[PDB]
Design a protein around this ligand. Structure first.
Ligand code: JJ7
Ligand code: JJ7
Length: 284
């Protein structure tokens, strides 16, 4: 079925939970043996969210190459994403090592450091120009260059220096700051505006390594971001845009990381975002 009318049909019939449970039942199951080794326990935020072995990002280190991060490679859309958990106190150096080694231009953050009164990720970037951060375990230096605070999101320019080689690179930090502590946003307008700002920066384009996107577990809000981006790109590429099937795209993405889209409300919100976005791209 088309999307917008499939959408109203699920709303009128109140069957979002059943649609979402079907997706959960059909999703891929691949091994995640490296994530479950005892030496990696303090590298995982949640015991039930792990990268598959076949798609995990490897650190360029011979001691321990493990990070909780996955490469999502979308062949028809010609887009790749790295989805990862929010960094832990003992993985902030690994996180920036990954950004460096994978040649990423941008980092997309969809959570606040504290939500619901609890810490959802480490404070992993500097908050003042004159107070830079050094990660001694991976030999990297990180400096805040500029910060632009807007009503729904903040964009930061950061300098990452490999202290071994003295090479430097400019990294863009796109921070969506207004996702509610509970539930999903009422309108997708600010989330779509944010997606378009990431696109306009070059951070999603083939002349760079894959964008790094995270929330707390790296599967819920993060899954919504890449699902909406890929569906909109496919609607632009194909002769028949109504052929794009958001459930089929989501199951394809779940071949590369488990659990993408965590609730039926997140699934409905993803539909809403793609539907509204497809009108702005053109003219209705
Ligand atoms: C004087 O301490 C400088 C610490 N630089 C960074 C600060 C952020 N870090 C954590 C674990 O939160 C990792 C080390
Ligand atoms: C039955 O018609 C459904 C049309 N789907 C539309 C077709 C045009 N689209 C775009 C993005 O050009 C969005 C999807």
């Amino acid at each position: 079925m088309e999307m917008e009318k499939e959408f109203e049909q699920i709303d009128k019939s109140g069957s979002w939970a059943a649609i979402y449970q079907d997706i959960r039942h059909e999703a891929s199951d691949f091994p995640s043996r490296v994530a479950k080794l005892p030496k990696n326990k303090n590298r995982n935020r949640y015991r039930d969210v792990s990268p598959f072995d076949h798609s995990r990002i490897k650190l360029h280190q011979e001691d321990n190459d493990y990070i909780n991060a996955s490469l999502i490679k979308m062949e028809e859309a010609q887009r790749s994403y790295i989805l990862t958990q929010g960094p832990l106190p003992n993985t902030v150096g690994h996180f920036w090592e990954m950004v460096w080694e994978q040649k990423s231009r941008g980092v997309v953050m969809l959570n606040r450091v504290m939500e619901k009164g609890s810490l959802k990720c480490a404070q992993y970037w500097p908050q003042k120009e004159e107070k830079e951060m050094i990660f001694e375990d991976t030999n990297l230096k990180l400096t805040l260059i500029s910060e632009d605070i807007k009503s729904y999101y903040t964009v930061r320019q950061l300098e990452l220096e490999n202290l071994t080689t003295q090479e430097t690179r400019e990294i863009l930090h796109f921070h969506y700051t207004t996702w509610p502590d509970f539930g999903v946003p009422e309108s997708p307008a600010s989330f779509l505006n944010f997606l378009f700002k990431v696109r306009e920066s070059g951070s999603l384009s083939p002349e760079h390594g894959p964008v790094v996107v995270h929330c707390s577990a790296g599967i819920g809000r993060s899954g919504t971001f890449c699902l909406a981006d890929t569906c909109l790109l496919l609607m632009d590429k194909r002769k028949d845009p109504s052929s794009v099937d958001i459930k089929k795209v989501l199951l394809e993405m779940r071949k590369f990381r488990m659990g993408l889209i965590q609730t039926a409300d997140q699934l409905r919100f993803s539909y809403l975002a793609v539907i509204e976005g497809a009108k702005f791209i053109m003219g209705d």
